[PDB]
């Protein structure tokens, strides 16, 4: 539990430092120094765009990995006595893997709207570019997180159903609906990811 | 107009792409080695039969290495800060993809190694599940390659 | 020991090598424009003309033929070893 | 050929004594399943329970004899006339008598083993005596106790002996130089001899109770040094003489076992045949009207005559009234598949046989697919050389299949490869063709009959000239413009695309579009097969109400995308990009699956109307008409004079599953293309990292070590490319088979074939 203690300590120390520096800044009538606008402006939109793309694919793939292993261990454990489940249950596995696919194609579409800048100043050069970069970063974060979470849900449900199949093999069809509901929830995530970056111009 | 510190992002993109994949491969190798050692105490003839999770981790490490080599060979002094962020994003993506793939590879390989030690007929089915793990890591690689140009 | 697996691996690797380096040597002799990146290059030859490029192409080709030569040599040695092992019994 | 092979069922009339002969003859023929007729048996009503018990006893005797023989390391070579004859009832007694003589010999061997255990105890005493010969040097009321104890109990002994003390413990001892195998246990147990000089009578009792609780075998070694030598020599002489006697007796036993291996193999076949016969008789039914027996038989229509021939054997020697009659009823009688009748191509079926098709003649699996199956386009990695390597390996292995099957197997993986040799070879041929069309031989392209493109027309006409050294100083990797050019490779992809640096983008677009077209046509064919599958099984309501919506929706949503891809490919040219220089494609993805409004860009006349019409016919109409089904008949049924709930809920779940699965499988068809790109990049990087290093200047130094570098290349190409990535694609395409390709026309499971093939050799 030492790692948990270290993480909690870092969390609480950083948040205490942040609240104390905020109260010091607002007390000392030094509000103008704590400029969020300058941070969001002078920062390059390319970092936001590329980080959004990377997270969009990476969260998807790691959620899919969580699902596939959390269901594969269950399958291999429950398949010792009944070898027939070693393949028939696979219909609930590809979901997770297909969930990861919902990232890469998505990771293409956002990446389809990346252009160079050849500009440095932020005054009237980059307003639409700023919006495009932030919007595509948000869409990437949305798809990545939603896809990861739906992957872990689908893997959990698939492991449960696979262990259910170990006793009565006739309930798999009656129980298939939950994981397709989870996959549909991932589809909602991908749909809103599409819509968020639907109308954005980059350049 | 070339901004300073531009190569920093690409350098850590390559470093992450190598390192995270290396860590995932190491975890997979460790878990599968523990599983093999546990299983070999009763079925000695089945040692080389299911050594393949180790080579799967090696494959993930190979994906990390090839992405890192490509990114490093694409590195120049005057990065326009548009290529560097692309390289960093691809590197981080492929690195965490390799980490997750190694995670799944290790866990499922240990489980399947124990199962095939217990039930000899379970190996081939395990194959399918295990192979899917690599695919996930593979996705990182491809999503890096397209990110190497656009 | 000169096990059957070792001899078979040596023979197949030798055959693989001889065919591939012969085809490399031929493709270098024609000087195909695909392996140009593979071919070594020095900046002082850029203005000299294609003659220097063809000269170094011939040099690397000859390197490939001698490589295939010792590949054939060790393949023949492996064949002799495996034939002696077979005829011993 | 045809995947129907109607099974049908039959009744098998029998007799009292003729039944055994007829059943043995049929088992020799082995073309019948013999579905059970009496379920309420539970062995208690098995009739021939005593025969089954005798068979079990014989099997136990055979297993014990075989285990003893394997411990003796004696071969079981029994080749020749293995299926001699099904065992008659009378000769079973003589075979059992011979087995009883063998068991008596085994019992004598067990008594010998007990005597050997006693001799091993004597040998342990002799070793403790050998230690006592050296303990006289240590001697120079310390209670001298020596004992034999397992090496595993040594540590705890230390913590369980010093703490009690009450006189202190002086444990000076050594261990046996080898892990002396205890014959009582039979394992190479690790032992040791512990010696202590604790104290007199009270600690003597304490040590004796410690040894009693700890199983340590204490020996009261005497103090005089003579008698130890003579009794050690005597026990050694007894040990060697008795060991020689026992070795001679067991050598005679194994000499008999040389022929007894084939003898008990034949006995095993006979007892297995008898057990199968009695199991079938238990499954068979006995009538009270006569002494005859009626057995339900699952036999093929073609083999029926041969079945009658079995009766011809019955009517000849044992009885004359044993016929068989085709039982053509419809209640239950779910026939087995039995359609898996084919030559080497049967390997294909095995890969399909991971699901157990069943469902009678509906089966439409491998033979329709074979080549167009996702198991011969299971390459997507063809590198010319990789294909030729796979073909060479498979061809050499097929040329050697005779001696390979004749010789013993190596490993289960080798067994799988042997089962797959045919598919491996034909996949190698297709990989060769795919490498040719891809024009990527070891990631290096091939220039055959021209290459198209040029540079001088691009620069002289295009004013991009005078870049000889300026292009090597000012325009590094800059020039990429088409002037007066065009014209595709007559066969594949130009090598110029390979040696370029925009290779990634063009190859990505080309592979993704090839992905879409191939996947759509494949899934269309898979769904179209279901129409024939269902028209064979009558059912006009499902044909005119359930699958027409599926095809309509699938076409209206995906064939439009395919046609758009082809139109984009054909209706443009190099000097036709909209304002911007290239734009790559710019229309493949912005035409999504919904395209709400706006869009702009490419808005060719009529496309909006076609899109809207396809959306309304597909998204709004197809799911709605996929509803109802049996209730439509139920109304008529309700007007004549089925569980609505389960029917409509199952139909609803199937409809949502299919409608989501169209998109899901369209996305999942993208998988093998990632393997294609990864394999291409892996080959290219391996080349540029090993071979590019290996070929350089200073020919002597550049080629003296070329052998080692090229051997490393061969090993890497075999390991990560040929096998690893090869296996990855091998199973990727099988998944594409089993998730979307074949999960469109055939559904369900059924019992496989089960004849009396005498699988036990």
From Swiss-Prot, chain B:
Subcellular location as annotated: Cytoplasmic vesicle, Clathrin-coated vesicle membrane; Cytoplasmic vesicle, Secretory vesicle, Synaptic vesicle membrane
Membrane topology: Multi-pass membrane protein
Lumenal side: 72-87, 148-150
Topological domain spans for side Cytoplasmic: 29-50, 110-126
Gene3D superfamilies: lithium bound rotor ring of v- atpase (1.20.120.610)
UniProt KW keywords: Cytoplasmic vesicle, Hydrogen ion transport, Ion transport, Membrane, Synapse, Transmembrane, Transmembrane helix, Transport, Ubl conjugation
Main location group: membrane
A biological-process GO annotation: synaptic vesicle lumen acidification
Membrane as UniProt keyword: yes
Purpose: Proton-conducting pore forming subunit of the V0 complex of vacuolar(H+)-ATPase (V-ATPase), a multisubunit enzyme composed of a peripheral complex (V1) that hydrolyzes ATP and a membrane integral complex (V0) that translocates protons. V-ATPase is responsible for acidifying and maintaining the pH of intracellular compartments and in some cell types, is targeted to the plasma membrane, where it is responsible for acidifying the extracellular environment.
PANTHER family referenced in this protein's UniProt entry, alphabetically: V-TYPE PROTON ATPASE PROTEOLIPID SUBUNIT (PTHR10263)
Family named by the database record: Belongs to the V-ATPase proteolipid subunit family.
Name of this chain's protein: V-type proton ATPase 16 kDa proteolipid subunit c
Gene: Atp6v0c
From Swiss-Prot, chain D:
Keyword Transmembrane helix: yes
Family annotation (Pfam families): V_ATPase_I
Organism superkingdom: Eukaryota
Species for this entry: Rattus norvegicus (Rat)
Name this polypeptide is given: V-type proton ATPase 116 kDa subunit a 1
Gene Ontology cellular component list: clathrin-coated vesicle membrane; cytoplasm; melanosome; membrane; perinuclear region of cytoplasm; plasma membrane; synaptic vesicle membrane; terminal bouton
One record GO biological process: vacuolar acidification
Alphabetically ordered keywords of this record: Cytoplasmic vesicle, Hydrogen ion transport, Ion transport, Membrane, Phosphoprotein, Synapse, Transmembrane, Transmembrane helix, Transport
Keyword Transmembrane (UniProt): yes
Family affiliation: Belongs to the V-ATPase 116 kDa subunit family.
PTM sites of type Phosphotyrosine: 338
Subunit and partners: V-ATPase is a heteromultimeric enzyme made up of two complexes: the ATP-hydrolytic V1 complex and the proton translocation V0 complex. The V1 complex consists of three catalytic AB heterodimers that form a heterohexamer, three peripheral stalks each consisting of EG heterodimers, one central rotor including subunits D and F, and the regulatory subunits C and H. The proton translocation complex V0 consists of the proton transport subunit a, a ring of proteolipid subunits c9c'', rotary subunit d, subunits e and f, and the accessory subunits ATP6AP1/Ac45 and ATP6AP2/PRR. Interacts with SPAAR.
Entry-annotated residues carrying Phosphothreonine: 224, 334
Cytoplasmic topological intervals: 1-362, 401-415, 530-547, 741-761
């Amino acid at each position: 539990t030492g790692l948990e203690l270290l993480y909690l300590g870092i969390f609480v120390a950083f948040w205490a430092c942040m609240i104390v520096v905020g109260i010091c800044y607002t007390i000392f009538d030094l509000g103008f120094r704590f400029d969020v606008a300058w941070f969001l402006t002078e920062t390059s939109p390319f970092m936001w765009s590329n980080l959004g793309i990377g997270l969009a694919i990476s969260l998807s793939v790691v959620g899919a990995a969580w699902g596939i292993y959390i269901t594969g261990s269950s399958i291999i454990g429950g398949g010792v006595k009944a070898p027939r489940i070693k393949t028939k249950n696979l219909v609930s596995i590809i979901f997770c893997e297909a969930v990861a696919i919902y990232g890469i194609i998505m990771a293409i579409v956002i990446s389809n709207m990346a252009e160079p800048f050849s500009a440095t100043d932020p005054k009237a050069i980059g307003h639409r570019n700023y919006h495009a970069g932030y919007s595509m970063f948000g869409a990437g974060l949305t798809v990545g997180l939603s896809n990861l979470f739906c992957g872990v849900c689908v893997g959990i449900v698939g492991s449960g159903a696979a262990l259910a199949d170990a006793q009565n093999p006739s309930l798999f069809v009656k129980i298939l609906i939950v994981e397709i509901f989870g996959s549909a929830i991932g589809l909602f995530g991908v749909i809103v990811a599409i819509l968020q970056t639907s109308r954005v111009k980059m350049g | 107009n070339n901004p300073e510190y531009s190569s920093f992002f690409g350098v850590m993109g390559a470093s992450s792409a190598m390192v995270f994949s290396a860590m995932g491969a190491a975890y997979g190798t460790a878990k599968s080695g523990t599983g093999i050692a546990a299983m070999s105490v009763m079925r000695p003839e089945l040692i080389m039969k299911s050594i393949i999770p180790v080579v799967m981790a090696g494959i993930i490490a190979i994906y990390g290495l090839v992405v890192a080599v490509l990114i490093a060979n694409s590195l120049t002094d005057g990065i326009t800060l548009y290529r560097s962020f692309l390289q960093l994003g691809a590197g981080l993506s492929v690195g965490l993809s390799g980490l997750a793939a190694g995670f799944a590879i290790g866990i499922v390989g240990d489980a399947g190694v124990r199962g095939t030690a217990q039930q000899p007929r379970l190996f081939v089915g395990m194959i399918l599940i295990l192979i899917f793990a690599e695919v996930l890591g593979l996705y990182g690689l491809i999503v890096a390659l397209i990110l190497s140009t656009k | 020991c000169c096990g059957p697996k070792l001899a078979a691996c040596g023979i197949v690797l030798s055959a693989w090598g001889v065919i591939m380096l012969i085809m490399l040597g031929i493709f270098f002799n024609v000087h195909s424009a695909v392996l140009i990146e593979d071919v070594p290059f020095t900046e002082k030859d850029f203005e000299n003309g294609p003659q220097n490029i063809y000269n170094l192409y011939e040099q690397v080709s000859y390197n490939c033929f001698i490589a295939a030569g010792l590949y054939l040599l060790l393949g023949g040695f492996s064949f002799c070893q495996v034939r002696l092992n077979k005829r011993k019994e | 050929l045809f995947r129907s092979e109607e099974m049908t069922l039959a009744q098998l009339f029998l007799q009292s004594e003729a039944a055994y002969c007829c059943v043995s003859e049929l088992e020799e023929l082995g073309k019948v399943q013999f579905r059970d007729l009496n379920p309420d048996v539970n062995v208690f009503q098995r009739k021939f329970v005593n025969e089954v018990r005798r068979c079990e006893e014989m099997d136990r005797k055979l297993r014990f004899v075989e285990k003893e023989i394997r411990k003796a390391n004696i071969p079981i070579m029994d080749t020749g006339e293995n299926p001699e004859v099904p065992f008659p009832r009378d000769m079973i007694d003589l075979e059992a008598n011979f087995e009883k003589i063998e068991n008596e010999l085994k019992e004598i061997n067990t008594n010998q083993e007990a005597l050997k255990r006693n001799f091993l105890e004597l040998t342990e005493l002799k070793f403790i005596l050998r230690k006592t010969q050296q303990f006289f040097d240590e001697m120079a009321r310390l209670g001298f106790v020596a004992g034999v104890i397992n090496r595993e109990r040594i540590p705890t002994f230390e913590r369980m002996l010093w703490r009690v003390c009450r006189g202190n413990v002086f444990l000076r001892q050594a261990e046996i130089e080898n892990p002396l195998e205890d014959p009582v246990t039979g394992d190479y147990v690790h032992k040791s001899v512990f010696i202590i000089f604790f104290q007199g009578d009270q600690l003597k009792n304490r040590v004796k109770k410690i040894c009693e609780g700890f199983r340590a075998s204490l020996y009261p070694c005497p103090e005089t040094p003579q008698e130890r030598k003579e009794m050690a020599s005597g026990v050694n002489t007894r040990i060697d003489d008795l060991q020689m006697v026992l070795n001679q007796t067991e050598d005679h036993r194994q000499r008999v076992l040389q022929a007894a291996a084939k003898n008990i193999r034949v006995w095993f076949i006979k007892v297995r045949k008898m057990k199968a016969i009695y199991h079938t008789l238990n499954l068979c039914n006995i009538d009270v009207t006569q002494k005859c027996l009626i057995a339900e038989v699952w036999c093929p229509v073609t083999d029926l005559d041969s079945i009658q021939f079995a009766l011809r054997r019955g009517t000849e020697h044992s009885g004359s009234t044993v016929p068989s009659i085709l039982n053509r009823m419809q209640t239950n009688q779910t026939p087995p598949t039995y359609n898996k009748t084919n030559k080497f191509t049967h390997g294909f079926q095995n890969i399909v046989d991971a699901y157990g098709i069943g469902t009678y003649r509906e089966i439409n699996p491998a033979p329709y697919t074979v080549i167009t199956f996702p198991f011969l386009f299971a390459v997507m990695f063809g590198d010319f050389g990789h294909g030729i390597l796979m073909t060479l390996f498979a061809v050499w292995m097929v040329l050697r299949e005779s001696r390979i099957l004749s010789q013993k197997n190596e490993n289960e993986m080798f067994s799988m490869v042997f089962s797959g040799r045919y598919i491996i070879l034909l996949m190698g041929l297709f990989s060769i063709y795919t490498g040719l069309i891809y024009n990527d031989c070891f990631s290096k392209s091939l220039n055959i009959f021209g290459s198209s493109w040029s540079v001088r027309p691009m620069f002289t006409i295009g004013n991009w000239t005078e870049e000889t050294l300026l292009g090597s100083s000012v325009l590094q990797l800059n020039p990429a413009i088409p002037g007066v050019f065009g014209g595709p490779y007559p066969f594949g992809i130009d090598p110029i695309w390979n040696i370029a640096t925009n290779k990634l983008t063009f190859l990505n677009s080309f592979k993704m579009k090839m992905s879409v077209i191939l996947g759509i046509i494949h899934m269309l064919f898979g769904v179209s097969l279901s129409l024939f599958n269902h028209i064979y099984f009558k059912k006009p309501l499902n044909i005119y109400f359930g699958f027409i919506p599926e095809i309509i929706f699938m076409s209206s949503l995906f064939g439009y995308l395919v046609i758009l891809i082809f139109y984009k490919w054909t209706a443009y040219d190099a000097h036709s990009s909209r304002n911007a220089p290239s734009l790559l494609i710019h229309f493949i993805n912005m035409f999504l699956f919904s395209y709400p409004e706006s869009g702009n860009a490419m808005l060719y006349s009529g496309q909006k109307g076609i899109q809207c019409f396809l959306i309304v016919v597909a998204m709004l109409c197809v799911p709605w008409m996929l509803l109802f089904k049996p209730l439509i008949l139920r109304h008529q049924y309700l007007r004549k004079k089925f569980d609505f709930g389960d029917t409509m809920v199952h139909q609803a779940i199937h409809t949502i599953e299919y409608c989501l699965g169209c998109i899901s499988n369209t996305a999942s068809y993208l998988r093998l293309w990632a393997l294609s790109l990864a394999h291409a990049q892996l080959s290219e990087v391996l080349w540029t990292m090993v071979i590019h290093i290996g070929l350089h200047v200073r020919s002597l130094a550049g080629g003296l070590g070329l052998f080692f570098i090229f051997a490393a290349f061969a090993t890497l190409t075999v390991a990560i490319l040929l096998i690893m990535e090869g296996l990855s694609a091998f199973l990727h395409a099988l998944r594409l088979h089993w998730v979307e390709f074949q999960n469109k026309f055939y559904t369900g499971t059924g019992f496989k074939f089960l004849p009396f093939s005498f699988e036990h050799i």
